[PDB]
């Protein structure tokens, strides 16, 4: 049920198309995905997982 | 990792390590260099299942790293 919960919170039960992931959201080009990775921080904080 | 492994070839070889990457961005980037450029480029839809790929990839990289 923990993993089912992760499914619930991340899938959302719908593809919104316009919303802010809790953690950004993409455009539709390949090297843009590479850049998307580039702007991600190196060390994150555990509230990204929901964890304290 | 078996000691009592004579070093005849350990003294003359090329050593490489391929345990999975540490950081969230590290694993995410690696995953974005496993199944790419024909999985990604074969779509016939930029809208829905592009988003599904991104969802599942992010899920993968999160649940793996949770164990830290």
């Amino acid at each position: 049920e923990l993993f089912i919960t992760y499914g619930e919170t991340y899938l959302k039960d719908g593809i919104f198309g316009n919303d802010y992931f809790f953690p950004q959201n993409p455009s539709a080009e390949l090297i843009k995905y590479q850049e998307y990775i580039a702007k991600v921080p190196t060390v994150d904080n555990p509230e990204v997982f929901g964890l304290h | 990792q078996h000691p009592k492994f004579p070093l005849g070839l350990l003294q003359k070889t090329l050593k490489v390590t391929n345990e999975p990457p540490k950081g969230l961005k590290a694993g995410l980037y690696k995953t974005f260099t496993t199944i790419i450029t024909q999985e990604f480029i074969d779509k016939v839809d930029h809208s829905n299942w592009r988003s599904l790929i991104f969802t599942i990839c992010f899920l993968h990289s999160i649940v793996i790293e949770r164990k830290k």
Side-chain angles (χ1 to χ4, degrees), chain A residues 1-12 14 17 23 26 28 38 41 46-52, chain B residues 1-43 45-68:
Chain A
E1 52 274 60
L2 189 144
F3 182 75
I4 297 169
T5 52
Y6 267 87
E8 190 277 331
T9 71
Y10 283 44
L11 266 55
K12 187 259 282 172
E47 271 66 359
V48 67
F49 311 130
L51 277 296
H52 187 31
Chain B
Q1 287 85 28
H2 180 223
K4 196 183 165 179
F5 173 26
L7 59 85
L9 61 85
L10 300 170
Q11 206 85 329
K12 151 53 179 64
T13 186
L14 269 47
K15 305 140 200 285
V16 183
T17 54
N18 278 40
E19 61 266 21
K22 173 57 212 160
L24 198 152
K25 164 159 72 183
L28 191 40
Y29 170 50
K30 188 269 183 181
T31 47
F32 264 97
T33 72
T34 69
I35 175 163
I36 54 156
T37 308
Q38 173 47 26
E39 179 66 83
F40 292 167
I41 291 186
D42 184 77
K43 301 194 254 293
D45 170 84
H46 267 281
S47 51
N48 282 99
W49 181 65
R50 182 179 64 82
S51 58
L52 276 296
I53 297 169
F54 182 76
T55 300
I56 301 299
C57 290
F58 206 107
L59 264 165
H60 186 83
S61 296
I62 288 281
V63 298
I64 291 158
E65 184 56 22
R66 171 60 176 288
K67 69 174 71 62
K68 159 179 86 199

